[PDB]
C-alpha cells in the first residue's frame, strides 16, 4: 500500500496507534505482521507557493 503523508505522522502507521490519520483515513490491525518503509521526499513534492 503506497501513499504520502506529512513528516510528523509517519509514527502513526503502526499497530494500535491512535491519531488523526490512523483513526480516520488509514488503519492497520493490532496483529499486523509485515512492515513499513517511509522516505522523506520533498524534492518532488513541495512547490514554491
Amino acid at each position: 500500500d503506497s501513499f504520502v503523508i506529512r513528516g510528523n505522522e509517519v509514527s502513526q502507521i503502526a499497530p494500535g496507534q491512535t491519531g488523526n490519520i490512523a483513526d480516520y483515513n488509514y488503519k492497520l490491525p493490532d496483529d499486523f505482521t509485515g512492515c513499513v518503509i517511509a522516505w522523506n521526499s520533498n524534492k518532488l513534492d513541495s512547490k514554491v507557493g
Binding site: 499497530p15 494500535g16 491512535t18 493490532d30
Partner: protein, 49 residues
C-alpha cells in the same frame, strides 16, 4: 469442643470458598482490579498486557 471434627470440616470448606471469592479484588500488579476500567481508560495495546 466435643464435636470438633464435624465443626472443623464445615469451617474449612466455608473459609476456602471465602478466600477464593475475596481474591478477585486483588490487583496482582495491574493498574486496576475491575476489567471495565482497564478496557475504558486505555488503548487496546496496553490493555492487553
Amino acid at each position: 469442643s466435643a464435636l470438633g471434627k464435624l465443626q472443623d470440616v464445615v469451617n474449612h470448606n466455608a473459609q476456602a470458598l471465602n478466600t477464593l471469592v475475596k481474591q478477585l479484588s486483588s490487583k496482582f500488579g495491574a493498574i486496576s482490579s475491575v476489567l471495565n476500567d482497564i478496557l475504558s481508560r486505555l488503548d487496546p495495546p496496553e490493555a492487553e498486557v
